[PDB]
Design an enzyme around this catalytic site. Structure first.
Site, PDB file in Angstrom:
ATOM      1  CG  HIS A  61      -1.698  -1.371   1.246  1.00  0.00           C
ATOM      2  ND1 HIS A  61      -2.677  -1.721   0.327  1.00  0.00           N
ATOM      3  CD2 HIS A  61      -1.637  -2.387   2.121  1.00  0.00           C
ATOM      4  CE1 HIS A  61      -3.170  -2.904   0.630  1.00  0.00           C
ATOM      5  NE2 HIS A  61      -2.529  -3.346   1.713  1.00  0.00           N
ATOM      6  CG  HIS A  91       2.513   5.354   6.353  1.00  0.00           C
ATOM      7  ND1 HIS A  91       2.171   5.268   7.686  1.00  0.00           N
ATOM      8  CD2 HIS A  91       1.503   5.990   5.735  1.00  0.00           C
ATOM      9  CE1 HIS A  91       0.957   5.787   7.846  1.00  0.00           C
ATOM     10  NE2 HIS A  91       0.531   6.262   6.656  1.00  0.00           N
ATOM     11  CG  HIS A  93      -0.732   8.418   2.241  1.00  0.00           C
ATOM     12  ND1 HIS A  93      -1.458   7.258   2.114  1.00  0.00           N
ATOM     13  CD2 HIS A  93      -0.495   8.565   3.564  1.00  0.00           C
ATOM     14  CE1 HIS A  93      -1.697   6.768   3.329  1.00  0.00           C
ATOM     15  NE2 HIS A  93      -1.122   7.550   4.245  1.00  0.00           N
ATOM     16  CD  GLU A 103      -4.057   9.379   2.975  1.00  0.00           C
ATOM     17  OE1 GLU A 103      -3.875   9.363   4.195  1.00  0.00           O
ATOM     18  OE2 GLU A 103      -4.504   8.427   2.307  1.00  0.00           O
ATOM     19  CG  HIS A 116       0.103  10.015   7.415  1.00  0.00           C
ATOM     20  ND1 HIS A 116      -0.887   9.351   6.709  1.00  0.00           N
ATOM     21  CD2 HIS A 116      -0.133  11.331   7.290  1.00  0.00           C
ATOM     22  CE1 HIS A 116      -1.674  10.274   6.173  1.00  0.00           C
ATOM     23  NE2 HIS A 116      -1.247  11.487   6.522  1.00  0.00           N
ATOM     24  CB  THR A 195      -6.131   7.821   5.760  1.00  0.00           C
ATOM     25  OG1 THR A 195      -4.787   7.358   5.573  1.00  0.00           O
ATOM     26  CG2 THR A 195      -6.184   9.108   6.558  1.00  0.00           C
ATOM     27  CB  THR A 196      -4.931   2.446   5.376  1.00  0.00           C
ATOM     28  OG1 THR A 196      -4.332   2.441   6.670  1.00  0.00           O
ATOM     29  CG2 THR A 196      -4.099   3.253   4.416  1.00  0.00           C
TER      30      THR A 196
HETATM   31  N1  LIG Z   1      -2.660   6.317   6.706  1.00  0.00           N
HETATM   32  S1  LIG Z   1      -2.732   6.280   8.459  1.00  0.00           S
HETATM   33  O1  LIG Z   1      -3.946   6.870   8.937  1.00  0.00           O
HETATM   34  O2  LIG Z   1      -1.599   6.943   9.044  1.00  0.00           O
HETATM   35  N2  LIG Z   1      -2.711   4.548   8.603  1.00  0.00           N
HETATM   36  C1  LIG Z   1      -1.783   3.857   9.495  1.00  0.00           C
HETATM   37  C2  LIG Z   1      -2.173   2.383   9.517  1.00  0.00           C
HETATM   38  N3  LIG Z   1      -1.171   1.733  10.331  1.00  0.00           N
HETATM   39  C3  LIG Z   1      -1.333   1.611  11.785  1.00  0.00           C
HETATM   40  N4  LIG Z   1      -2.182   2.263  12.585  1.00  0.00           N
HETATM   41  O3  LIG Z   1      -2.002   1.846  13.882  1.00  0.00           O
HETATM   42  N5  LIG Z   1      -1.012   0.906  13.830  1.00  0.00           N
HETATM   43  C4  LIG Z   1      -0.597   0.741  12.594  1.00  0.00           C
HETATM   44  C5  LIG Z   1       0.565  -0.172  12.144  1.00  0.00           C
HETATM   45  N6  LIG Z   1       1.639   0.148  11.591  1.00  0.00           N
HETATM   46  O4  LIG Z   1       2.554  -0.911  11.352  1.00  0.00           O
HETATM   47  N7  LIG Z   1       0.337  -1.554  12.593  1.00  0.00           N
HETATM   48  C6  LIG Z   1      -0.820  -2.204  13.195  1.00  0.00           C
HETATM   49  C7  LIG Z   1      -0.676  -2.995  14.334  1.00  0.00           C
HETATM   50  C8  LIG Z   1      -1.779  -3.667  14.834  1.00  0.00           C
HETATM   51  C9  LIG Z   1      -3.017  -3.580  14.187  1.00  0.00           C
HETATM   52  F1  LIG Z   1      -4.075  -4.268  14.735  1.00  0.00           F
HETATM   53  C10 LIG Z   1      -3.146  -2.811  13.015  1.00  0.00           C
HETATM   54 BR1  LIG Z   1      -4.839  -2.639  12.087  1.00  0.00          BR
HETATM   55  C11 LIG Z   1      -2.041  -2.128  12.506  1.00  0.00           C
HETATM   56 ZN   LIG Z   2      -1.116   7.379   6.287  1.00  0.00          ZN
END
Ligand SMILES: NS(=O)(=O)NCCNc1nonc1/C(=N/O)Nc1ccc(F)c(Br)c1
Ligand SMILES: [Zn+2]
Length: 257
Positions: A61, A91, A93, A103, A116, A195-196
């Site tokens: 992603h 990470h 986008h 985003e 982010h 956002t994912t």
């Molecule tokens: N685009 S954003 O909003 O910044 N999305 C970030 C998505 N990633 C994560 N958010 O919070 N923990 C994350 C992450 N990074 O490795 N691991 C993670 C760990 C446990 C879980 F149950 C999930 Br679901 C994701």
């Molecule tokens: Zn993000």
């Protein structure tokens, strides 16, 4: 299964993740003329001096740099936050062209990319528990515009050829995320979501006003990454951004006048 294509992109996510149509989804457009300056907001404390980076991963992603979050090594405090939020990963986008990729938007302006830095609230003990709380996470969002090179990004750019396809990872120790920050910590803040998928509604967003500049050569290297795994048809990892979602009953606050 989810992605950013016509057949699996953001308009489809609500079928597996119905919270996609929830009351506090991210990202949003930041209307600078309706955001409220909040003089009771404290300065943000970004304490990254003891950060321990571990690995860089193409997750299909985005690409992410992961950190040791077993102790208070790299933390966010202050601003709109109560307590201490540990850095887990960062990470990006980004777009296929320099006029899209972010985003969040600012008065409908899209930046070339958005960084982010994802943090979790230490009162919930681990990120899996934090994900289930309305104040579990804090994401520091930083816009990228194309201009001068960002020297603190070059170590990231130079390793991306080693993680071209989904599932590839590499050692990425001794990376200093302080090198990714702009001069100013002036910010907007609002309650939102990841956002994912799983689009969990537990994020305090902190979006910095000042973008960082990156060079055209730096962002071109992002655009050489692949969504696909090794052996699959080559599909460039570009336009891995979710568009702005309805603000609904939310107020964006500004730390600055
Ligand atoms: N685009 S954003 O909003 O910044 N999305 C970030 C998505 N990633 C994560 N958010 O919070 N923990 C994350 C992450 N990074 O490795 N691991 C993670 C760990 C446990 C879980 F149950 C999930 Br679901 C994701
Ligand atoms: Zn993000």
């Amino acid at each position: 299964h989810w992605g950013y294509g016509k057949h699996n992109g953001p308009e489809h996510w609500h079928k597996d993740f119905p919270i996609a149509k929830g009351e506090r989804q991210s990202p949003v457009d930041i209307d600078t003329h309706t955001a409220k300056y909040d003089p009771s907001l404290k300065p943000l404390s970004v304490s990254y001096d003891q950060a321990t980076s571990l690995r860089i991963l193409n997750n299909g992603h985005s690409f992410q740099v992961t950190f040791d979050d077993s102790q208070d090594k790299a933390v966010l405090k202050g601003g709109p936050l109560d307590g201490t939020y540990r850095l887990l990963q960062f990470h990006f986008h980004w777009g296929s062209l320099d006029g899209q990729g972010s985003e969040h938007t600012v008065d409908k302006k899209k930046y070339a990319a958005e960084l982010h830095l994802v943090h979790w609230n230490t009162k919930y003990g681990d990120v899996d528990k934090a994900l289930q709380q309305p104040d579990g996470l804090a994401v520091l969002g930083i816009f990228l515009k194309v201009g001068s090179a960002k020297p603190g990004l070059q170590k990231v750019v130079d390793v991306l050829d080693s993680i071209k396809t989904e599932g590839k990872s590499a050692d990425f120790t001794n990376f200093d995320p302080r090198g990714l920050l702009p001069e100013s910590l002036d910010y907007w803040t609002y309650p939102g979501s990841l956002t994912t998928p799983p689009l969990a509604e537990g994020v305090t967003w902190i979006v910095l006003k000042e973008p960082i500049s990156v060079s055209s050569e730096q962002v071109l290297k992002f655009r050489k990454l692949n969504f696909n795994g090794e052996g699959e048809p080559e599909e460039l990892m570009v336009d891995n951004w979710r568009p702005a979602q309805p603000l609904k009953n939310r107020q964006i606050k500004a730390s600055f006048k």
